[PDB]
Design a protein around this motif. Sequence first.
Motif: not given
Length: 55
Positions: A4, A44, A50-53
């Motif tokens: 991704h 980063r 990483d809270t992608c949702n």
Amino acid sequence: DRNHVGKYTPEEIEKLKELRIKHGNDWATIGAALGRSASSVKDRCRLMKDTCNTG
């Protein structure tokens, strides 16, 4: 699976983490090598996850 890629490739991220230990605190030099913002490679790596949702 980590497929991704955005602006940061898995090589660039591994490289920032490589240079992180190798330099210590020289995020300016890390980002300068990567062609990225020193602040952004630092943020980063600091976030780590990483809270992608949303939820």
